[PDB]
Amino acid sequence: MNTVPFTSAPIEVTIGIDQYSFNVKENQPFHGIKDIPIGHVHVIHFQHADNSSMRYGYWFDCRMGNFYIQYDPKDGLYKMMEERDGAKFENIVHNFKERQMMVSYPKIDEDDTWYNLTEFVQMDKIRKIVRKDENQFSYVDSSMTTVQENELLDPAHSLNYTVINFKSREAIRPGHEMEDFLDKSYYLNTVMLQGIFKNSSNYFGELQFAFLNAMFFGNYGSSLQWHAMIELICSSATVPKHMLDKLDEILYYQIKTLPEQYSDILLNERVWNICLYSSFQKNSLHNTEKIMENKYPELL
Protein backbone atom coordinates (compact mmCIF):
# COMPACT_ATOMS: atom_id res chain seq x y z
CA MET A 1 0.00 0.00 0.00
CA ASN A 2 2.71 2.43 -0.95
CA THR A 3 2.42 5.43 -3.24
CA VAL A 4 4.46 7.03 -6.03
CA PRO A 5 3.14 10.59 -6.44
CA PHE A 6 3.69 12.66 -9.62
CA THR A 7 4.39 16.36 -9.40
CA SER A 8 2.36 16.84 -12.57
CA ALA A 9 1.78 15.46 -16.07
CA PRO A 10 2.94 18.19 -18.49
CA ILE A 11 3.06 15.95 -21.56
CA GLU A 12 0.66 13.37 -22.95
CA VAL A 13 1.93 9.90 -22.11
CA THR A 14 0.96 6.27 -21.68
CA ILE A 15 2.01 5.19 -18.19
CA GLY A 16 2.57 1.57 -17.24
CA ILE A 17 2.73 0.22 -13.74
CA ASP A 18 3.76 -3.44 -13.82
CA GLN A 19 1.41 -5.20 -16.27
CA TYR A 20 -1.14 -2.34 -16.17
CA SER A 21 -1.26 0.84 -18.23
CA PHE A 22 -3.38 3.95 -18.72
CA ASN A 23 -3.25 7.11 -20.76
CA VAL A 24 -2.68 10.55 -19.32
CA LYS A 25 -3.51 13.78 -21.20
CA GLU A 26 -1.28 16.84 -21.49
CA ASN A 27 -1.69 18.83 -18.27
CA GLN A 28 -4.27 16.40 -16.90
CA PRO A 29 -4.62 16.65 -13.09
CA PHE A 30 -2.79 13.39 -12.48
CA HIS A 31 -0.68 13.03 -9.36
CA GLY A 32 0.38 9.42 -9.23
CA ILE A 33 -0.36 5.83 -8.31
CA LYS A 34 -1.39 4.59 -4.88
CA ASP A 35 -2.11 1.18 -3.27
CA ILE A 36 1.06 -0.36 -4.72
CA PRO A 37 1.46 -3.85 -3.17
CA ILE A 38 4.39 -4.07 -0.80
CA GLY A 39 6.72 -7.07 -1.07
CA HIS A 40 7.55 -7.11 -4.79
CA VAL A 41 9.74 -5.00 -7.06
CA HIS A 42 7.68 -2.83 -9.42
CA VAL A 43 8.31 -0.99 -12.66
CA ILE A 44 6.78 2.31 -13.72
CA HIS A 45 7.20 2.95 -17.42
CA PHE A 46 6.41 5.54 -20.07
CA GLN A 47 5.80 5.97 -23.76
CA HIS A 48 5.27 9.53 -24.93
CA ALA A 49 2.27 10.12 -27.18
CA ASP A 50 4.14 12.46 -29.50
CA ASN A 51 7.15 10.20 -29.79
CA SER A 52 6.87 6.50 -29.32
CA SER A 53 10.66 6.10 -29.52
CA MET A 54 10.67 7.58 -25.98
CA ARG A 55 10.18 4.25 -24.15
CA TYR A 56 11.68 3.96 -20.68
CA GLY A 57 10.98 3.24 -17.06
CA TYR A 58 12.19 2.69 -13.47
CA TRP A 59 12.45 -0.44 -11.36
CA PHE A 60 11.92 0.25 -7.66
CA ASP A 61 10.80 -1.20 -4.34
CA CYS A 62 8.89 1.15 -1.99
CA ARG A 63 10.42 -0.62 0.98
CA MET A 64 13.67 1.11 0.02
CA GLY A 65 12.50 4.72 0.17
CA ASN A 66 9.94 7.32 -0.85
CA PHE A 67 9.97 7.81 -4.62
CA TYR A 68 8.10 10.21 -6.87
CA ILE A 69 8.04 11.16 -10.58
CA GLN A 70 8.66 14.65 -11.94
CA TYR A 71 8.84 15.72 -15.57
CA ASP A 72 12.06 17.41 -16.64
CA PRO A 73 11.43 19.82 -19.51
CA LYS A 74 15.15 20.05 -20.33
CA ASP A 75 15.82 16.32 -20.73
CA GLY A 76 12.26 15.77 -21.90
CA LEU A 77 11.31 12.87 -19.69
CA TYR A 78 9.54 11.78 -16.55
CA LYS A 79 12.24 11.16 -13.97
CA MET A 80 12.11 9.17 -10.74
CA MET A 81 13.51 10.89 -7.70
CA GLU A 82 13.75 9.99 -4.01
CA GLU A 83 12.29 12.32 -1.43
CA ARG A 84 14.35 12.17 1.75
CA ASP A 85 12.03 14.32 3.93
CA GLY A 86 9.58 11.71 5.22
CA ALA A 87 7.17 14.25 6.71
CA LYS A 88 7.12 16.30 3.50
CA PHE A 89 6.40 13.16 1.44
CA GLU A 90 3.54 11.82 3.57
CA ASN A 91 1.89 15.26 3.48
CA ILE A 92 2.09 15.55 -0.31
CA VAL A 93 0.69 12.04 -0.65
CA HIS A 94 -2.13 12.60 1.86
CA ASN A 95 -3.22 15.77 0.04
CA PHE A 96 -3.18 14.05 -3.36
CA LYS A 97 -5.23 11.17 -1.97
CA GLU A 98 -7.77 13.45 -0.31
CA ARG A 99 -8.23 15.21 -3.63
CA GLN A 100 -8.51 11.78 -5.33
CA MET A 101 -5.98 12.66 -7.97
CA MET A 102 -4.28 9.26 -7.98
CA VAL A 103 -4.84 6.01 -9.88
CA SER A 104 -5.17 2.87 -7.80
CA TYR A 105 -2.93 -0.09 -8.60
CA PRO A 106 -5.66 -2.51 -9.78
CA LYS A 107 -6.47 -5.17 -7.20
CA ILE A 108 -8.44 -8.36 -7.89
CA ASP A 109 -7.04 -10.54 -5.10
CA GLU A 110 -7.36 -13.83 -7.02
CA ASP A 111 -4.61 -12.73 -9.37
CA ASP A 112 -1.03 -13.77 -8.64
CA THR A 113 0.34 -12.67 -12.04
CA TRP A 114 2.80 -10.10 -10.82
CA TYR A 115 4.12 -12.27 -8.03
CA ASN A 116 4.55 -15.11 -10.56
CA LEU A 117 6.50 -12.89 -12.96
CA THR A 118 8.79 -11.43 -10.29
CA GLU A 119 9.09 -14.29 -7.78
CA PHE A 120 12.89 -14.38 -7.94
CA VAL A 121 13.51 -10.75 -8.89
CA GLN A 122 15.23 -8.72 -6.20
CA MET A 123 16.08 -5.03 -6.22
CA ASP A 124 19.65 -5.64 -5.08
CA LYS A 125 20.22 -7.95 -8.08
CA ILE A 126 18.61 -5.45 -10.46
CA ARG A 127 21.05 -2.83 -9.17
CA LYS A 128 24.02 -5.03 -10.10
CA ILE A 129 22.74 -5.38 -13.69
CA VAL A 130 21.85 -1.68 -13.96
CA ARG A 131 24.75 0.18 -12.37
CA LYS A 132 23.93 3.61 -10.84
CA ASP A 133 24.81 3.40 -7.17
CA GLU A 134 23.65 6.91 -6.28
CA ASN A 135 19.98 5.92 -6.75
CA GLN A 136 17.86 3.17 -5.13
CA PHE A 137 15.83 2.67 -8.34
CA SER A 138 17.02 1.68 -11.81
CA TYR A 139 16.36 3.24 -15.19
CA VAL A 140 15.98 1.02 -18.25
CA ASP A 141 14.91 1.91 -21.78
CA SER A 142 14.22 0.35 -25.16
CA SER A 143 17.67 1.15 -26.63
CA MET A 144 20.10 0.21 -23.87
CA THR A 145 22.55 -2.41 -25.07
CA THR A 146 23.86 -5.33 -23.07
CA VAL A 147 27.47 -5.88 -22.08
CA GLN A 148 27.50 -8.94 -24.31
CA GLU A 149 26.08 -7.09 -27.32
CA ASN A 150 28.65 -4.31 -27.05
CA GLU A 151 30.68 -4.40 -30.32
CA LEU A 152 30.41 -8.05 -31.34
CA LEU A 153 30.75 -9.19 -27.73
CA ASP A 154 27.82 6.08 -19.18
CA PRO A 155 28.06 2.74 -17.27
CA ALA A 156 24.43 2.96 -16.14
CA HIS A 157 23.41 2.84 -19.79
CA SER A 158 24.32 -0.78 -20.39
CA LEU A 159 22.64 -3.88 -19.02
CA ASN A 160 25.28 -5.97 -17.29
CA TYR A 161 23.57 -9.37 -17.77
CA THR A 162 25.68 -12.48 -17.23
CA VAL A 163 27.36 -13.37 -20.48
CA ILE A 164 26.30 -16.73 -21.91
CA ASN A 165 28.23 -17.92 -24.94
CA PHE A 166 27.98 -21.59 -26.01
CA LYS A 167 31.18 -21.44 -28.02
CA SER A 168 33.49 -20.00 -25.42
CA ARG A 169 36.29 -21.44 -23.33
CA GLU A 170 34.07 -20.79 -20.35
CA ALA A 171 31.42 -23.13 -21.79
CA ILE A 172 33.76 -25.87 -22.94
CA ARG A 173 36.35 -27.87 -20.97
CA PRO A 174 39.52 -28.85 -22.87
CA GLY A 175 39.26 -32.58 -23.54
CA HIS A 176 35.47 -32.51 -23.24
CA GLU A 177 34.77 -30.54 -26.39
CA MET A 178 32.06 -32.76 -27.88
CA GLU A 179 30.58 -33.69 -24.52
CA ASP A 180 30.26 -30.11 -23.34
CA PHE A 181 29.00 -28.69 -26.64
CA LEU A 182 26.33 -31.36 -26.99
CA ASP A 183 25.32 -31.48 -23.30
CA LYS A 184 25.55 -28.11 -21.56
CA SER A 185 25.19 -29.56 -18.02
CA TYR A 186 28.74 -28.59 -16.97
CA TYR A 187 28.27 -25.04 -18.17
CA LEU A 188 24.85 -24.78 -16.44
CA ASN A 189 25.60 -26.56 -13.15
CA THR A 190 29.28 -25.91 -12.44
CA VAL A 191 30.06 -22.67 -14.25
CA MET A 192 26.76 -20.77 -14.00
CA LEU A 193 24.86 -22.13 -11.02
CA GLN A 194 27.69 -23.03 -8.59
CA GLY A 195 30.19 -20.47 -9.83
CA ILE A 196 28.46 -17.27 -10.87
CA PHE A 197 24.82 -17.28 -9.74
CA LYS A 198 25.56 -19.29 -6.58
CA ASN A 199 21.99 -20.68 -6.72
CA SER A 200 19.01 -21.28 -9.00
CA SER A 201 17.00 -18.47 -7.38
CA ASN A 202 19.51 -15.88 -8.61
CA TYR A 203 19.60 -17.49 -12.06
CA PHE A 204 15.79 -17.38 -12.33
CA GLY A 205 15.76 -13.79 -11.05
CA GLU A 206 17.94 -12.61 -13.94
CA LEU A 207 15.89 -14.66 -16.40
CA GLN A 208 12.68 -13.06 -15.12
CA PHE A 209 14.18 -9.54 -15.19
CA ALA A 210 15.41 -10.07 -18.76
CA PHE A 211 11.95 -11.15 -19.89
CA LEU A 212 10.28 -8.17 -18.24
CA ASN A 213 12.70 -5.68 -19.82
CA ALA A 214 12.09 -7.29 -23.19
CA MET A 215 8.32 -7.17 -22.79
CA PHE A 216 7.94 -3.72 -21.29
CA PHE A 217 10.60 -1.84 -23.23
CA GLY A 218 11.05 -4.00 -26.31
CA ASN A 219 14.70 -4.21 -25.31
CA TYR A 220 16.34 -6.52 -27.81
CA GLY A 221 19.40 -7.44 -25.76
CA SER A 222 17.16 -8.46 -22.90
CA SER A 223 15.19 -10.73 -25.21
CA LEU A 224 18.49 -12.32 -26.32
CA GLN A 225 19.42 -12.90 -22.69
CA TRP A 226 16.03 -14.39 -21.73
CA HIS A 227 16.19 -16.89 -24.61
CA ALA A 228 19.84 -17.74 -23.85
CA MET A 229 19.03 -18.58 -20.25
CA ILE A 230 16.13 -20.84 -21.25
CA GLU A 231 18.18 -22.60 -23.94
CA LEU A 232 21.03 -23.26 -21.53
CA ILE A 233 18.70 -25.17 -19.19
CA CYS A 234 16.85 -27.05 -21.90
CA SER A 235 20.15 -28.00 -23.54
CA SER A 236 21.45 -29.63 -20.37
CA ALA A 237 20.89 -33.36 -19.87
CA THR A 238 21.26 -32.99 -16.10
CA VAL A 239 19.24 -30.39 -14.26
CA PRO A 240 17.85 -30.65 -10.72
CA LYS A 241 14.19 -31.71 -10.79
CA HIS A 242 13.01 -28.72 -8.76
CA MET A 243 14.56 -26.35 -11.25
CA LEU A 244 12.77 -27.91 -14.25
CA ASP A 245 9.46 -27.81 -12.46
CA LYS A 246 10.02 -24.18 -11.46
CA LEU A 247 11.13 -23.26 -14.98
CA ASP A 248 7.87 -24.65 -16.41
CA GLU A 249 5.87 -22.36 -14.06
CA ILE A 250 8.05 -19.34 -14.79
CA LEU A 251 7.75 -19.63 -18.57
CA TYR A 252 4.04 -20.45 -18.34
CA TYR A 253 3.26 -17.13 -16.70
CA GLN A 254 5.57 -15.24 -19.06
CA ILE A 255 3.91 -16.69 -22.15
CA LYS A 256 0.49 -16.14 -20.52
CA THR A 257 1.25 -12.46 -20.00
CA LEU A 258 2.78 -11.65 -23.38
CA PRO A 259 0.56 -9.59 -25.75
CA GLU A 260 -0.55 -11.96 -28.53
CA GLN A 261 0.23 -9.10 -30.91
CA TYR A 262 3.93 -8.93 -29.91
CA SER A 263 4.38 -12.70 -30.22
CA ASP A 264 6.24 -12.21 -33.50
CA ILE A 265 8.77 -9.72 -32.10
CA LEU A 266 9.30 -11.26 -28.65
CA LEU A 267 9.56 -14.98 -29.37
CA ASN A 268 12.51 -16.64 -31.16
CA GLU A 269 11.14 -19.48 -33.33
CA ARG A 270 14.40 -21.45 -33.53
CA VAL A 271 14.99 -21.38 -29.82
CA TRP A 272 11.43 -22.32 -28.79
CA ASN A 273 11.15 -25.17 -31.28
CA ILE A 274 14.44 -26.56 -30.10
CA CYS A 275 13.53 -26.14 -26.45
CA LEU A 276 10.07 -27.64 -26.64
CA TYR A 277 10.62 -30.30 -29.29
CA SER A 278 14.28 -31.34 -29.71
CA SER A 279 16.09 -30.59 -26.45
CA PHE A 280 16.99 -32.84 -23.52
CA GLN A 281 14.15 -31.19 -21.67
CA LYS A 282 11.56 -31.36 -24.48
CA ASN A 283 9.22 -33.36 -22.23
CA SER A 284 9.86 -31.48 -19.00
CA LEU A 285 7.91 -28.31 -19.80
CA HIS A 286 4.34 -29.59 -19.91
CA ASN A 287 2.55 -26.36 -18.94
CA THR A 288 4.67 -24.11 -21.12
CA GLU A 289 4.26 -26.34 -24.15
CA LYS A 290 0.53 -26.51 -23.63
CA ILE A 291 0.10 -22.73 -23.40
CA MET A 292 2.45 -22.11 -26.35
CA GLU A 293 0.66 -24.60 -28.59
CA ASN A 294 -2.73 -23.10 -27.76
CA LYS A 295 -1.74 -19.43 -27.84
CA TYR A 296 0.96 -19.33 -30.52
CA PRO A 297 0.59 -22.45 -32.70
CA GLU A 298 1.63 -20.50 -35.80
CA LEU A 299 5.02 -20.11 -34.14
CA LEU A 300 5.92 -23.79 -33.79
Binding site: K167, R169, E177, M178
Partner: protein, 253 residues
Amino acid sequence: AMNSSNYAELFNNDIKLFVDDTNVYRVTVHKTFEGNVATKAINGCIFTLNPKTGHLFLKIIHTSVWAGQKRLSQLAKWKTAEEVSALVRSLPKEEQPKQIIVTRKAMLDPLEVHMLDFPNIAIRPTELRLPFSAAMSIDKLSDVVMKATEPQMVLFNIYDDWLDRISSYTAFSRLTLLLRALKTNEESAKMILLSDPTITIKSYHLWPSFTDEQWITIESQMRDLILTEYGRKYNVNISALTQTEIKDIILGQ
Protein backbone atom coordinates in the same frame (compact mmCIF):
# COMPACT_ATOMS: atom_id res chain seq x y z
CA ALA B 1 32.45 -18.43 -47.28
CA MET B 2 34.66 -19.63 -50.15
CA ASN B 3 33.11 -19.63 -53.61
CA SER B 4 33.88 -19.31 -57.33
CA SER B 5 34.12 -15.54 -56.82
CA ASN B 6 36.98 -15.52 -54.29
CA TYR B 7 38.78 -18.56 -55.74
CA ALA B 8 42.20 -16.96 -56.30
CA GLU B 9 42.47 -16.51 -52.54
CA LEU B 10 43.42 -20.19 -52.36
CA PHE B 11 46.77 -19.46 -53.97
CA ASN B 12 47.91 -16.38 -52.14
CA ASN B 13 50.61 -16.40 -49.48
CA ASP B 14 48.32 -16.76 -46.47
CA ILE B 15 48.61 -20.37 -45.26
CA LYS B 16 45.32 -22.26 -45.52
CA LEU B 17 44.12 -25.84 -45.30
CA PHE B 18 41.08 -27.62 -46.79
CA VAL B 19 39.70 -30.30 -44.52
CA ASP B 20 37.44 -32.99 -46.00
CA ASP B 21 35.85 -35.51 -43.60
CA THR B 22 33.90 -37.58 -46.10
CA ASN B 23 36.13 -40.65 -45.78
CA VAL B 24 36.59 -40.60 -42.00
CA TYR B 25 33.82 -43.02 -41.10
CA ARG B 26 33.53 -45.78 -43.72
CA VAL B 27 31.41 -48.88 -43.54
CA THR B 28 30.14 -51.84 -45.48
CA VAL B 29 26.46 -52.73 -44.90
CA HIS B 30 25.62 -56.47 -44.75
CA LYS B 31 22.96 -58.93 -43.59
CA THR B 32 23.22 -60.92 -40.34
CA PHE B 33 22.20 -64.54 -39.78
CA GLU B 34 18.80 -63.45 -38.48
CA GLY B 35 18.42 -61.35 -41.60
CA ASN B 36 18.93 -57.94 -40.02
CA VAL B 37 21.32 -55.36 -41.31
CA ALA B 38 24.64 -54.53 -39.69
CA THR B 39 27.57 -52.32 -40.59
CA LYS B 40 31.23 -53.17 -40.45
CA ALA B 41 33.65 -50.24 -40.28
CA ILE B 42 36.82 -50.12 -42.34
CA ASN B 43 39.79 -47.77 -42.02
CA GLY B 44 39.17 -44.20 -43.08
CA CYS B 45 41.14 -40.98 -43.34
CA ILE B 46 40.96 -37.24 -42.91
CA PHE B 47 42.10 -35.37 -46.01
CA THR B 48 43.79 -32.07 -45.05
CA LEU B 49 45.39 -30.26 -47.96
CA ASN B 50 47.32 -27.03 -48.44
CA PRO B 51 46.15 -26.06 -51.95
CA LYS B 52 49.06 -23.70 -52.52
CA THR B 53 51.86 -26.16 -51.84
CA GLY B 54 50.07 -29.52 -52.43
CA HIS B 55 51.12 -30.75 -48.98
CA LEU B 56 48.61 -33.33 -47.85
CA PHE B 57 48.36 -34.45 -44.21
CA LEU B 58 46.51 -37.75 -44.42
CA LYS B 59 45.47 -38.85 -40.96
CA ILE B 60 44.49 -42.48 -41.07
CA ILE B 61 41.46 -43.34 -38.90
CA HIS B 62 41.83 -46.92 -37.73
CA THR B 63 38.65 -48.87 -36.98
CA SER B 64 39.66 -49.23 -33.34
CA VAL B 65 38.63 -45.61 -32.70
CA TRP B 66 34.98 -46.55 -33.17
CA ALA B 67 35.01 -49.48 -30.73
CA GLY B 68 32.22 -49.17 -28.17
CA GLN B 69 31.16 -45.74 -29.40
CA LYS B 70 27.62 -44.66 -30.28
CA ARG B 71 26.27 -42.31 -32.99
CA LEU B 72 29.35 -42.78 -35.13
CA SER B 73 28.41 -40.38 -37.93
CA GLN B 74 28.22 -37.59 -35.35
CA LEU B 75 31.32 -38.76 -33.55
CA ALA B 76 33.25 -38.79 -36.80
CA LYS B 77 32.86 -35.02 -37.18
CA TRP B 78 34.24 -34.47 -33.69
CA LYS B 79 37.10 -36.91 -34.21
CA THR B 80 37.99 -35.02 -37.40
CA ALA B 81 38.02 -31.74 -35.52
CA GLU B 82 40.10 -33.22 -32.68
CA GLU B 83 42.72 -34.44 -35.16
CA VAL B 84 42.83 -31.20 -37.22
CA SER B 85 43.28 -29.21 -34.02
CA ALA B 86 46.01 -31.65 -32.89
CA LEU B 87 47.75 -31.19 -36.26
CA VAL B 88 47.61 -27.42 -35.93
CA ARG B 89 49.12 -27.56 -32.43
CA SER B 90 51.89 -29.81 -33.73
CA LEU B 91 53.02 -27.30 -36.37
CA PRO B 92 55.51 -24.49 -35.62
CA LYS B 93 53.72 -21.14 -35.30
CA GLU B 94 54.97 -19.89 -38.65
CA GLU B 95 53.47 -23.00 -40.33
CA GLN B 96 50.06 -22.79 -38.72
CA PRO B 97 47.18 -21.94 -41.09
CA LYS B 98 45.50 -18.59 -41.01
CA GLN B 99 42.28 -20.19 -42.32
CA ILE B 100 40.78 -23.65 -42.40
CA ILE B 101 38.18 -24.31 -45.06
CA VAL B 102 35.80 -27.22 -44.42
CA THR B 103 34.25 -28.94 -47.37
CA ARG B 104 31.07 -29.76 -45.48
CA LYS B 105 29.25 -27.22 -43.31
CA ALA B 106 28.49 -29.77 -40.60
CA MET B 107 32.19 -29.54 -39.68
CA LEU B 108 32.01 -25.86 -38.70
CA ASP B 109 30.78 -26.19 -35.11
CA PRO B 110 32.99 -29.16 -34.16
CA LEU B 111 36.07 -27.47 -35.57
CA GLU B 112 35.22 -24.06 -34.13
CA VAL B 113 34.84 -25.64 -30.72
CA HIS B 114 38.13 -27.59 -30.94
CA MET B 115 39.94 -24.47 -32.14
CA LEU B 116 38.91 -22.09 -29.33
CA ASP B 117 42.55 -21.76 -28.30
CA PHE B 118 43.28 -20.29 -31.75
CA PRO B 119 40.89 -17.31 -31.99
CA ASN B 120 42.84 -15.85 -34.95
CA ILE B 121 42.41 -18.87 -37.21
CA ALA B 122 39.35 -18.37 -39.41
CA ILE B 123 37.14 -21.44 -39.89
CA ARG B 124 35.16 -21.12 -43.14
CA PRO B 125 32.72 -23.18 -45.18
CA THR B 126 32.69 -23.30 -48.97
CA GLU B 127 30.09 -23.08 -51.76
CA LEU B 128 32.48 -25.06 -53.94
CA ARG B 129 31.58 -28.69 -54.64
CA LEU B 130 35.00 -30.27 -54.32
CA PRO B 131 35.69 -33.88 -55.33
CA PHE B 132 37.97 -34.74 -52.38
CA SER B 133 35.87 -37.80 -51.46
CA ALA B 134 37.57 -39.41 -54.47
CA ALA B 135 40.95 -39.30 -52.73
CA MET B 136 40.52 -43.00 -51.92
CA SER B 137 40.54 -43.71 -55.67
CA ILE B 138 44.24 -42.78 -55.74
CA ASP B 139 45.83 -46.20 -55.41
CA LYS B 140 48.72 -45.30 -53.14
CA LEU B 141 46.44 -43.38 -50.75
CA SER B 142 43.92 -46.20 -50.63
CA ASP B 143 46.77 -48.66 -50.03
CA VAL B 144 48.23 -46.87 -47.01
CA VAL B 145 44.80 -46.40 -45.43
CA MET B 146 43.77 -50.07 -45.83
CA LYS B 147 47.08 -51.45 -44.58
CA ALA B 148 47.20 -49.39 -41.34
CA THR B 149 47.05 -51.40 -38.15
CA GLU B 150 46.99 -48.37 -35.87
CA PRO B 151 46.30 -44.61 -36.09
CA GLN B 152 48.94 -43.04 -38.35
CA MET B 153 49.71 -39.72 -40.07
CA VAL B 154 51.25 -39.88 -43.53
CA LEU B 155 52.49 -36.84 -45.48
CA PHE B 156 52.29 -36.61 -49.28
CA ASN B 157 52.57 -33.94 -51.94
CA ILE B 158 49.37 -34.40 -53.91
CA TYR B 159 50.82 -32.44 -56.86
CA ASP B 160 53.90 -34.68 -57.19
CA ASP B 161 56.46 -32.37 -58.90
CA TRP B 162 53.98 -30.39 -60.99
CA LEU B 163 54.80 -27.08 -59.29
CA ASP B 164 58.25 -27.16 -60.93
CA ARG B 165 56.43 -26.51 -64.22
CA ILE B 166 52.99 -24.99 -63.41
CA SER B 167 51.36 -22.56 -60.97
CA SER B 168 49.35 -23.66 -57.91
CA TYR B 169 46.18 -22.42 -59.57
CA THR B 170 46.85 -24.71 -62.53
CA ALA B 171 47.94 -27.61 -60.28
CA PHE B 172 44.76 -27.37 -58.20
CA SER B 173 42.66 -27.27 -61.39
CA ARG B 174 44.41 -30.38 -62.67
CA LEU B 175 43.95 -32.12 -59.30
CA THR B 176 40.22 -31.35 -59.08
CA LEU B 177 39.67 -32.40 -62.71
CA LEU B 178 41.38 -35.73 -62.03
CA LEU B 179 39.42 -36.26 -58.83
CA ARG B 180 36.14 -35.26 -60.49
CA ALA B 181 36.76 -37.89 -63.22
CA LEU B 182 37.68 -40.53 -60.63
CA LYS B 183 34.52 -39.73 -58.70
CA THR B 184 32.31 -39.86 -61.83
CA ASN B 185 33.68 -43.03 -63.45
CA GLU B 186 36.55 -44.49 -61.54
CA GLU B 187 37.20 -47.43 -63.86
CA SER B 188 37.33 -45.24 -66.97
CA ALA B 189 39.48 -42.60 -65.31
CA LYS B 190 42.03 -45.16 -64.12
CA MET B 191 42.16 -46.63 -67.61
CA ILE B 192 42.97 -43.20 -69.08
CA LEU B 193 45.69 -42.72 -66.45
CA LEU B 194 47.29 -46.16 -66.54
CA SER B 195 46.87 -47.22 -70.18
CA ASP B 196 50.22 -46.36 -71.78
CA PRO B 197 52.61 -48.50 -69.68
CA THR B 198 55.67 -46.64 -70.98
CA ILE B 199 54.46 -43.80 -68.74
CA THR B 200 55.02 -44.92 -65.17
CA ILE B 201 54.45 -43.54 -61.66
CA LYS B 202 57.67 -42.81 -59.78
CA SER B 203 58.07 -44.62 -56.45
CA TYR B 204 57.87 -41.22 -54.74
CA HIS B 205 54.81 -39.98 -56.73
CA LEU B 206 51.03 -40.53 -56.79
CA TRP B 207 50.34 -39.82 -60.47
CA PRO B 208 52.11 -40.86 -63.70
CA SER B 209 55.09 -38.96 -65.13
CA PHE B 210 53.37 -37.27 -68.08
CA THR B 211 55.15 -34.70 -70.19
CA ASP B 212 53.53 -31.29 -70.64
CA GLU B 213 52.08 -32.42 -73.99
CA GLN B 214 50.79 -35.68 -72.46
CA TRP B 215 49.04 -33.83 -69.61
CA ILE B 216 47.12 -31.80 -72.18
CA THR B 217 45.94 -35.04 -73.79
CA ILE B 218 45.15 -36.65 -70.42
CA GLU B 219 43.20 -33.58 -69.34
CA SER B 220 41.01 -33.46 -72.45
CA GLN B 221 40.38 -37.20 -72.04
CA MET B 222 39.21 -36.54 -68.47
CA ARG B 223 36.92 -33.72 -69.63
CA ASP B 224 35.44 -36.02 -72.28
CA LEU B 225 34.90 -38.70 -69.59
CA ILE B 226 33.01 -36.26 -67.40
CA LEU B 227 30.87 -35.04 -70.28
CA THR B 228 30.19 -38.58 -71.54
CA GLU B 229 29.11 -39.64 -68.01
CA TYR B 230 26.95 -36.57 -67.75
CA GLY B 231 25.14 -37.56 -70.98
CA ARG B 232 24.78 -41.21 -69.90
CA LYS B 233 23.28 -40.06 -66.59
CA TYR B 234 20.74 -37.54 -67.88
CA ASN B 235 20.09 -39.29 -71.23
CA VAL B 236 21.23 -36.22 -73.21
CA ASN B 237 22.95 -36.24 -76.61
CA ILE B 238 26.17 -34.42 -75.77
CA SER B 239 26.56 -33.65 -79.50
CA ALA B 240 24.11 -30.74 -79.14
CA LEU B 241 25.95 -29.20 -76.17
CA THR B 242 27.69 -25.86 -76.64
CA GLN B 243 31.20 -24.91 -75.55
CA THR B 244 29.80 -22.85 -72.66
CA GLU B 245 27.44 -25.56 -71.43
CA ILE B 246 30.34 -27.99 -71.68
CA LYS B 247 32.69 -25.95 -69.43
CA ASP B 248 30.16 -25.61 -66.58
CA ILE B 249 29.48 -29.36 -66.39
CA ILE B 250 33.21 -30.05 -66.36
CA LEU B 251 33.77 -27.61 -63.52
CA GLY B 252 31.12 -29.16 -61.29
CA GLN B 253 31.96 -26.79 -58.42
